[PDB]
Each structure stands twice: as C-alpha cells, then as structure tokens.
C-alpha cells in the first residue's frame, strides 16, 4: 500500500517520542520503591504491576512512526530478558538515556556514525572495567535463587544443588512433591523453540507442555501435509501429544498443524533439529537413542508416510519454551543411551581438530534431566512453593549466563572512564553520552523514592567503591554489606543491549510505514 | 463598566500564573551568571538587560486577572527598591516562592489566615536572627559602605571620611567634581516628594530640577488658584522656576499648576511642608532662614495674594525625588542661619522631655554639610560613580542608626528556625513555607550558573556559618573571605516585602476587574 | 496596552526568524557579484539596489516579535555605518552567523552567559590578531586613503597632500571646486549633533544647513522658552537662521523650537556645547572668538533675555550632521582668533599634567584648515566624488591615530585562534561559534558568484597569508597584489558590532510587545 516516508530530523522526533512513551511508562517501576502501572484488562478488573516486562508488552502507539520507535527500544528489554533473564527495566532506562542525548547531538550537527563509535568504545571499555569490579559459584547461585523467591532459603538451596548435579548448563525441571520434603533426582535440552506460537497450551509460562508424547524425528523439511496424515492418525490413539523434531517445518505444513491444534485436541507441536548441516543429523541420532526411536533420513524420506509408531521415540514429558526444548525422561534408558555415549566418548580420542572435540564433548554432556519435587505441604502451599522455585530457577539461569546494586556499579565504572577519548570531537561526545546514561538507573531509582536524584547521585559519586544509596531504608552505606547486589551478567547485558539498539536508532536516516490514509 | 468576578481557587489560579510570568522573567537575571532579557523597543534595536527592575517595568499581561497578580508582586520589587535600593530580584524570587507554596496549601485546605500568621512569625524571628548574624566605629561604616558600593573600597572609605568629619548623624551630600580627581570638603533635605508627577522635567532620573528658583513658604493649604495668580506673575520674571512648600496643595490648585507646566515653560513645582502640626511651621521657619524668605502664616494668609518676591526665599538649585526634596545653597548664609542654629541649640538645654531634644537635634543637624565630590572619570562615568556613592551612602546611614552573600545568609537563618512552631498545624505549614522560600535565592543563582540547585543547596546546608557557594568561580568556600557580601538591610527588606505582598495574596478571596466584553 | 510575553525558546525562535529575514535580504548584495533587490516605491517604479544599507532600512515584519529581532540586528548595520562608514553588509552576515549558531547552542542546553563570554574572548583576540596582520609615513596615509576611497589612487594622494601640509593631526575639510579641476589650499568642527531631528532641512543628507546664521552661545541649559522670545525676534530680521550652542536645550524649550520650525521659516537649530564641565565653557570661548560673539555665562544668565545681535556670533555657513557640527568661515578672523591661539599655545608651556597639554593641543588644532576641493566632474559627479573623499578622509584619520579583502582576512585570523580556549566547554563552544562566523563573509561573496562556498573556503584556508579568491575574475591569487583591500577599521568594526548585538540577543530570556489583539 501507499507508504509514508520521513527523513532525518522528521524521523528522529517521531522516534524519540515513541521511545519516551515506552521508557517513561516502564521506568516508573524501577527499584524497591517502584510505582504501580495499571494495564486495562479486556474483561474484568485492570492489571496492577510493578513488573516492567509486563508493561512494555502492552505498549503500542497510534502514530505509525512513534510506534516504530517504541517497538525498536522494546527490543532492548526482550533481548536482555532472553540473555540475563532480568534487568529489562534497567536496560530500558539506559537505552532512552543514550537515545535522548544521542539524537540531540545529531540535531546539533554531530556525525551519527562517529557518535555510535564513541558510544560503542565506551561500552567495551565499560564492560571490561565492570569485570574488574566483579554468578559462577554455588554461593552466588543460591543467593540469587533465594532473592528470586522472596528470601526463601529453601528454594535457593534446591536450585543450587540442582545446578550442581547436572551442571549450570544441564536441564532442570520442577514437579509436584509427594508428601512434604524436597526431592531432587536426575532421571535420564537443546536450543530450539516452537516454530510457531499458538502451540503454547500454557499461556502463563509461554511454553508448550506435552505428556507422554511421541517424537517424530525427520532429516528433511516437512511441507507436504498430506504425507504426514497417516502418521498423525497413528498418534491419534493413546499418545495424543506429538512432537515433530524435523530439519524444519515450512509454513505450509506448519500452518496446517496450527489450525488443527485449535479445537482438535492437543494434536502436534513442532520444532526444528538442533544444530545444522552435518552435526544436525548426528545430533538427531542422539535424540533417537534417548527417546528410543528411528530417524527418518533422506533415503527413508519415502518412509515418512509409512512411519509406524515403532519409529517414533517417546518421552515422559517435554517442555518447549520460546528458545529451548527439554525432553524429560526418554524411553531407551541405559544400554541404548550408554552405548551411544561410548562411541562419541571414543570420538574425542581420535584427535583431529580441537574444534571437533569441543563439539563432541557437548554431545556426551547432553546424553539427562534433574527433576525438583517441591515441598508438598497441605495442598495450596505446595502449589505456591512450585511457583516460587519455578520463577526463582528461571531468574537464576539468566543470572548465571556480582557488583554493587542500586545502579552504583555503572556510576563507579563511568568515573573510571572520565579520561576516555576517541578519534575526534564527535566520538568524544558519544563517549560522554554513554557515561551520562550510566547514571540513569540510580537517578531513576532515587526518583521513584521521592528523593532528588541529582543530590543522591552527587553524593554517591563523591564516595568510593561499594558506597551507594539504599533506596529501601533511604540510607547511604556499603551496598554489598547491606545485601544489595546485582549479577555482573544482568548489568553488562543491560548496557550492551541498550547501546546496540540505541546505536541503530542514532544511525537511522529514514523511516517508511504504511500510510494511515 | 460591567465587571468580572472570581472567587477562591478560580482567582488563585489566575494570580499564580500572573506572578509566575513576572517572577520567571525577572529571576533569570539573578546573580553573577544572570542571563539576558530582551525588551522590545518601540523604535530601533531591542534592549538587552540583566537588570531585574528594568524587566519588571515591562511586564503587563493580557488576561485581566493574571495581570492583577503580576502587578501585585511587582509591588515587592518597587518597595524593596525604594527601601534598600537593591535586591529587587531577590525579593521577587522570595515572593514567588512563598505565594506558590502558600496558594498550594490553601488549595489543599489550609486556612489562609493561619498560613499568613505562620509566615509572618517566621519572618519576624528570621530578621532578628539575621541581625544576630550581621555600626559605630569607622571600620564598620567603611566596611558596610564598600559592600553597599559593590565591594568598592574607595566609596566605602569616602563614606567613612565624611562621617568622620561631620559625624555619623551629620549632613552629607554628593555631587560632581569640578577638577576631576575626587574631593571631600565641609561647607557651611527633608522627606517630602512632589505632590504630583509631570513636574518631573528630567524623566531619566524621575526627579524635578529647578535652577535659581523662588520658594513660596505657606502655612496653609492652597486650593484657590486665583489668589496664587499675582505671585506667579511676579515669578514669571527673572527666576522662572518656583517651588511651593506649603502645608499641602489640594488637587484643585495642584491640577491647575500641572496643566500650566505643560507648554507654559518650567513654571512651578509643588511639595508639602516637612513634619506636621506644631513642628511643621517651626520647620518651615528653618527653611525660611536658609533661603532668606518669609513664611506666609495663618494671619498672613490674606497676604498670600500680595506676597512680594521679597517674601520668597531663593536657592542656587533644588532637586525633588519621589520622596525627597533637597535645597542646594540657600540665600541667607551665615548670620541668619547661624542665629537660627543658636536658638534651637539653646532649646535642647531647656530640658523637658527627651523626645523634644531628639526632634530639636534633628533640626540643628539639618541647618555643616559634608560635600562628597565623586571621581571625575570622563565626566560620563561621573554619573555612574555618583549614583553608586549615593546608594551606598543611603544604605550606610540606615545601618548606622553585612551578611554572607549568594543567598547563604537566609539559608543559614532557615536552619536555625527548624524548631519554630505556631498555634496550630496550618501555622506550622506557613512557617515551613517561609523557610523553604529562604533557599530560593541561592537555588536560583545556582540555576542560572547551569549547576544543579538541589545539590549545591544540600552542600551549603551541610556547611556552617559563612560557608557558601561562589557562583562566579564555581567554587565553595568562606563567602566573606571571598568578598561576597550582602548588606543586612537589602536582605531583610527583600524578605519582609516579599512576605507582606505574599501574605496579602494568600489572604485574597475575591478579584474584580472590568470585563473584556 | 495589553502585552504579549514570550520566554526562552519561544522568544528565541521569533528572534531568529526576524534576523534571518533581514540578513537574508541584505546579504544577497555582498561583494562584486552582489545580486539586486527591488524595493517597492510608494509611487512610480520600484527601487533597484545592491546597497545593503538601503535594503535594511525597508525591513519591517508583521509578527511583532520577529520584527523585534530584525530591528535588533539592524542596529549592527547602523552602528558599523556610523563608525567605519562601510561594511554594514559584512557586519550583518557576521551577526546572523553568530546568532544562528549561538541560539542553536542555547537550545542544545549551553549556558547563554558562558557562550557570550567565549564569543567576546574570541573577538578581542581576533581584533588584536587583525592589527598584527594590518600610519605615520605619507605612504601609509595615501595607501589607506586609496583603499578607503575604493582603490582610488587620486583620493588617497589628496589625503596624503593635505596631511603633509597641515599635518596628520591638523584640520581638513572638503567642499566643491570653484573652477573644475581639483584644488587643495591651506586657509587661515566639534562632536555634537542636533539635539532633535526635524531641524534637518535637507532630508537627503540627514543634516541641517544654515546660511549666514547667528550663533547664540550660552553657558546654561535653556528650558524657559519665554526668555528666548526677545532674542528670536531680533534674529527674525536679516539673518533668519539661528544656531543655539548652549550647555543643553531641554525638551521644554527644544519642543517649542521644533514646533516653530514647521511652517515658520527656517527658524532656529539647536545643539549642545562641546565638552563638559570646566573645558566646556573654555571651549565655548573658542567658538565665540571664531564667530565674533559673546558667551552668555552664569552671571550673564539674566542677559540671556536681553542678548543683542552684537552678542551673537556669525558664520558664512554651518552644517549639522547626526553627530557633528561644522562652523564654516567665522566672522572675527585673524586678530581675534590668532590672539586666542597665542594664549592656549602658551598654556601648553605651563607644564602641569600631560593630560592638560593634550586637551589644550586639541583646541589650538581646531582654531589653519586644509581645504580639499573635489574634482568638478559635471558638477553632478562632484557630489559623488565629494562623498567618497570625506568617507576616505574620516577613515584615514582614524587609522593615523589595510588587510586582505574578500573576507580572507577574518578567515586567516580564525586559523590562528584554533587553539583558543575558555574557562569551560560552553565558553569553548562560543569561541568556535565566533570562528565559524568569520568564514561567513567569504562564503557569502562566493555564494553570490554562483560558486560553491564550501570548496572556495576550503581552498583559501589551505593557502597562506594574502592568498584569497578574486570574486570578480573567478580566480585565486594574492589579494593585495590584485588590489582587493579592506580597511582594518571596517573589518574590526563589523566584527565587534556583530558580536555585541549577537551577545545581547543570545543573552535574552524574555520579550514583551503590545498585543495584536
């Protein structure tokens, strides 16, 4: 359709307004004194939140261009959430700060490209400086978990031990307990999410759950639909849920499965094979050995139509997040899986490239799941405990993949980079833009407290090291001694993502959108 | 004509906007880092100023009610200017601060009357506290003189020289120097201004100047016009200028003289007799002896019509300001004047009431005069140097019968009154309203510097005594050691006038104005 | 009437538009390739000009605020025209450049006061640097004379001839030639203009001309009107024109004379006495000796009314410009004047202060006169040649007590100040604002040629010294060798006036004007 095009400054103003609308709505929920935000529910009473992520999801503007700006900075929160699993609001306040001052410098005549270069330089030097000041050990892992579950020491300990058993990389799932106590057991996960939403049968978690499903392993991309019908019929009996782990399921057959899940029971859930090219099919073999199935390869491609339930692997349970699929308890234990492990473990011995050995080591490391059965007290208490552990786990994993909290770490880092220079004046301005934005988080936390940000900032900048401002007690002191910590992971992730999106927007010279007319 | 009436809140909002428009325009010119304000000239290039008084004079709003508010607070500046002769901008920032928070408290439900009482209480305790922090010895006279003269050591010394010669209670005048340099000599003025403007033949100074005029001294109030005609005719020859120092010139004969000055040469200038009742006519006799004239009393009232030029005293020159008339060089020197002095000097000996002696002492003091002849710098700068000396002289005499500058004095005073309470909560709120307004001056000075007012204020409040912030060098230190002083006179006057006008506005419940329709 | 008030940015935008409208209209006429501007005549064919001054006079905008901005920058042209007598367009392009970038920096957050300080610092260092790149010997006088006379060798020589005869400090006048050719002869003026316009009987020159007028010399300020009537009556016979050289003529008697000149013949013309205080009356005596009159002093003040025509001096002709009065051929030659000269010449011998001798030397210099009689070219071109000579003469005398043209001088000066810094970043920005504006003149000259300003500017900045761009031949080369010179006077005056007005506007925080409604 007819488009609307805006260049330079005209496009810059529309972007700035859009980011301000989103950022302002989000930033009010920062810190222990974060204010509430009312999100109008389609039906019933409105939602009350202090959670930034929840607020951002609702932000969409009428002005096509402003909305573009809001959707661009919304990428900061989502990316930081996907990486660190926390600190999205901090990322949003940092992004806005860099974009605000960045665009103002552009309007002043500064070179967009130079500005970006200066900002990027400040961020690289900042992250390394952040490392110097610095969630690896179980002490920290247990400390983050408890914090994520309202100081519940029980939950933090369960997570720490869970990660200590299967490694801070292994698959971990939370299940219901069987009469009090807290159980932990490894009962025999790849980076692939559902090819399309809607498969999400549990909207609250944004994940797909399948109980005792069959797993169709294919080495080709499904698109034909029709030749899949005979396999679907076979799965329609007993094991209702079906998990398709093919090379890829094209929009053709994929759209058919999506339309079939609606109304027609649980049906099927589709994801793509882990890895690519050569290692893709060898990786599929590992899944086949776990689940006890047969991979329908190129030559067996004709067989895709006459694939019996014997060729379909099976598992006790499977959970598919946005970008992670975990197969819990596969059917083909010991003998099969262990023999597979013996082969690959012998592959590393066949010394070739150091690369191969690393990749093969990842495979043997993958071939079980560690289930955490929660404290089964009464009935409702067990449901809450599971809700606590579930959220606390998710937050700890992101925290794993500490520095003084309250935004003092970034301020302390900015003080060190005061002499940082670039190749020119514009690059120097960009550097200072980044350093001024590193004060934004603390200033916003203080602003929400009802105190003057300029004063508190000045005082903390006057202090040294872990000297910061406790927004909870309205008192200054040693942040770490007061227990106000931030994983170095969430802090650097928030800064890096804020700077990348901000860098893109500052480098933008033209915007195109469908005309309202 | 038809009026427009607004009550309570409706009237309060209109007043607040009006005061904000005036105050905001004025306050930008506060301190050493005061910003410029462009005043559009009717013809030619616009005026550029950092002088608050000049800006305020131009302020007039379209909205009848808002204009009323602006004209009300404009009274603060004019009154403080008339009293201290400086600190009008400080007075305006104080007024706005009290009015802003005062009206907000009113809108919150507070009792206007109680609020005013609390504010007034805070101001009375503040001025006495200001006195504690703040003139007999020559050191004190010279010190306050330099401060009032904008840290000019020369001027401060001159005021000390004069008060050392004729005494601190003696007569002191200032005029241009004959042969450059800077002179001071002792050679052998009452509180009454022109009864009506227009007589002002010199618009630039806002004063009336008469050269070799005749002085008609009358002990009755002129209103008849007609019986004055014969005397005016006699003065129409040779000594064109005429000065009427009668008991009072009623609007009847006064309006006739005003209409006659226009087009009909310089004509006459009218003022009323110094003092009142009994001492009024005895005071007139003193003027008669100086000028060498005869006072037309009650009985001589008929003679008012046949008053010859012999009865009219004469002087070399006379200058009539808004509220001061000065007779320069009277004709009747030595013998006449000296004999008059001998009588009154002998009156004080006739011990009766201590009161009489004080009043009689004022008379003999008026009838030598220490003539300060300013430094003749290009004969153009003579006017600037002259103005600076008379302003400093006036301030020094008032002091005879300094605090830390940069608005730190008021802040230091506000710290002492932190425990000040009233008869109720509303009175306590009003007290705090006044104390918060005492920080306004410093915060505005800092705001104009480009620095954060909340931070600098916090730091100065953390210090002690003369510890303040030098806005010129952007450095903290001992204000007095840095030479940043403020006459206690300008400071207390600015606060008192700000509080009085603010008290009136906060007590206002109804506004009436001519309808625009 | 009701006013309209605008603050900060709102006032800044209105000012910028106004200055842009004026500057843009004016700058198109800059240089040898200046474009034409059509000025609509009230009656007849429109005016066609390449003269900037003529264009500026016509500029007046509808928007009250924008007009204020235009009238403010219009002050740059008028002031530079009054000082250097040329370079108004250059001044206007410099002003606009400083204001444009200055206001943009303000909008960016920069401190107005700091900016002004930086600009002022750049200008002071620039003018001294300009002096370095830039008059005792006849060669220097003639050289600067030709340059000021638009490279006219003839005029430059004449100024050298005159200063060789009566000295460089001597008196020099210019007038029409009697018998064509071009004459120069030595036969046996004060800084005071008409107290009020309207006296200007010759609108084309903006000056007052009186033929064989009487000269009333008074040592007091006239205001009485009435006592002047008898003297006016005496002058009403024979010598119709009258010139009043009193201490000052106050608006009272002045307004009466102005109303009398209208309809009532030529009447009288009033100006104030040269100098002030003591030397004022001694200076009046010198005029009295020339014209052959008697000065009515303080004591003779009564005589002001009975001042006979014998007391009134007389001259052959008198011309009163805006700020200069010249008495041509006084009646009291030789004996009287020469005796007066003998006294003052003997005063300098009485060694006291070096100051007195300088001032006394100025008096004897005023009381021979080198009469330059312009080349009589058709008696019509005589007026053009005459104007050109007096403008060049005025400029040469100022130089006694040239740089590369085409705007290259300022560019060369800006290159030197590349390392100039201030007390802070804002002051550094202001400095750079001034340096960027110094390229404006050349860029505008090139822009009018039809060539790319950025390219030519870059090339000249790449060159050295007098290397510039000849806009006439479209060729680069040594400006001075090509004969493209600019008096250092016009260049520094244009820069200083541009910076002062720009400094005021940048310091402006509020604008007030009569409401259109």
UniProtKB/Swiss-Prot annotation, chains A, B, C:
Its EC number is 5.6.1.7. ATP binds at residues 29-32, 50, 86-90, 406, 470-472, 486. Pfam families: Cpn60_TCP1 (PF00118). GO terms for cellular component: cytoplasm. It catalyses: ATP + H2O + a folded polypeptide = ADP + phosphate + an unfolded polypeptide. The keyword Thylakoid does not apply. It is found in: Cytoplasm. InterPro entries: Chaperonin_Cpn60_CS, Cpn60/GroEL, Cpn60/GroEL/TCP-1, GroEL-like_apical_dom_sf, GROEL-like_equatorial_sf, TCP-1-like_intermed_sf. Keywords: ATP-binding, Chaperone, Cytoplasm, Isomerase, Nucleotide-binding. Coiled coil: none annotated. GO terms for molecular function: ATP binding; ATP-dependent protein folding chaperone; isomerase activity; unfolded protein binding. Forms a cylinder of 14 subunits composed of two heptameric rings stacked back-to-back. Interacts with the co-chaperonin GroES. Together with its co-chaperonin GroES, plays an essential role in assisting protein folding. The GroEL-GroES system forms a nano-cage that allows encapsulation of the non-native substrate proteins and provides a physical environment optimized to promote and accelerate protein folding. Belongs to the chaperonin (HSP60) family. This is Chaperonin GroEL.
